[PDB]
Write a protein that binds this ligand. Structure first.
Ligand code: 728
Length: 164
């Protein structure tokens, strides 16, 4: 079936707990596979140790720049960037997992988890999964954001991997 992966997240060195994500490989296999492998780190790089760099309350929590650690970087398992696979899944509400980008066909490793329905991103960002468990952790992360996106705590993915 679809992969289940996890992110264990600290804020200021304090564990918040675990976010478990279903990756919709049935719908977006290439995008799911990228995220899965970045969680396990099996290609020699990935999300472990990277941060949530942009968090906007009543919007989303964005993470995944493990190359520049500032929101400008990241890379996929395929190369630096890869195409928008499809826009079949929509930004339907809180918990949606979707790819950050710098315009069409610029998926790398950066991703976001929605905290509301972000319908204006439909057809622009590739949705590829959702939160199975740990929305409480996502709400904590959200509470450490700000309007500008600047975080008020250092939010770090300390560990990550594949559950199934
Ligand atoms: N591969 C790669 C991906 C993203 C980037 C930086 N781009 C980026 O942060 N763009 C904004 C973006 O992807 N998102 C996700 C929803 C949160 C933020 C957004 C999107 C649309 C409108 C406002 C905002 Br903030 C650089 C390289």
């Amino acid at each position: 079936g679809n992969p289940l992966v996890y992110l264990d997240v600290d804020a200021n060195g304090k564990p918040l707990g675990r976010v478990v994500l279903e990756l919709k490989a049935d719908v977006v296999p290439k995008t799911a596979e990228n995220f899965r492998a970045l969680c396990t780190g099996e290609k020699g790089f990935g999300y472990k140790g990277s941060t949530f760099h942009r968090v906007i309350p009543s919007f989303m929590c964005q993470a995944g720049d493990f190359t520049n650690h500032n929101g400008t970087g990241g890379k996929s398992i395929y190369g630096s960037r890869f195409p928008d696979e499809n826009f079949t899944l929509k930004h339907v509400g809180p918990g949606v997992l979707s790819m950050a980008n710098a315009g069409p066909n610029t998926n790398g490793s950066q991703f976001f988890i929605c905290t509301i329905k972000t319908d204006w991103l439909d057809g622009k960002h590739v949705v590829f999964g959702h939160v199975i468990e740990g929305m409480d952790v996502v709400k904590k992360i959200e509470s450490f954001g700000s309007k500008s996106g600047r975080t008020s705590k250092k939010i770090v993915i300390t560990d990550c991997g594949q559950l199934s």
